[PDB]
């Protein structure tokens, strides 16, 4: 015989990584992997640091992807 598998509805992230959501947009608005040039602005916008922000971006993808068992 034989068999298969199917899906569809999946879980969703409740808690937000950070209030820097403003990035979530640019990530898929201008580029998923921006450069300092961009960080220069956000740095002030979200009173964050070019470095601190970067981390947020890298994490973004993780959350997006289907991989992420991290449960608060």
UniProtKB/Swiss-Prot annotation:
Superkingdom classification of source: Eukaryota
Region named Homeobox-like: 8-66
Effect in UniProt of substituting residue 65 to R: Does not affect ceramide synthase activity
Expressed in which tissues: Ubiquitously expressed, with highest levels in testis and kidney. Expressed in pulmonary epithelia.
Changes seen on gene knockout: Mice are viable and show no apparent morphological alterations in normal conditions. Decreased palmitoyl (C16:0) ceramide pools.
Locations listed in the record: Endoplasmic reticulum membrane
Protein modification: Phosphorylated at the C-terminus by CK2.
Function, as annotated: Ceramide synthase that catalyzes the transfer of the acyl chain from acyl-CoA to a sphingoid base, with high selectivity toward palmitoyl-CoA (hexadecanoyl-CoA; C16:0-CoA). Can use other acyl donors, but with less efficiency. N-acylates sphinganine and sphingosine bases to form dihydroceramides and ceramides in de novo synthesis and salvage pathways, respectively. Plays a role in de novo ceramide synthesis and surfactant homeostasis in pulmonary epithelia.
Known partners and oligomeric status: Interacts with PAQR4; the interaction regulates the stability and activity of CERS5 and is inhibited in presence of ceramides.
Recorded domain comment: The last loop motif confers selectivity toward palmitoyl-CoA (hexadecanoyl-CoA; C16:0-CoA) as acyl donor.
Protein name as it appears in the record: Ceramide synthase 5
């Amino acid at each position: 015989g034989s068999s298969g598998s199917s899906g569809g509805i999946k879980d969703s992230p409740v808690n937000k990584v950070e209030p820097n959501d403003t990035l979530e947009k640019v990530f898929v608005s201008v580029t998923k992997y921006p450069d300092e040039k961009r960080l220069k602005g956000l740095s002030k916008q979200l009173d964050w640091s070019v470095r601190k922000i970067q981390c947020w971006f890298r994490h973004r993808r993780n959350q997006d992807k289907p991989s992420g068992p991290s449960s608060g």
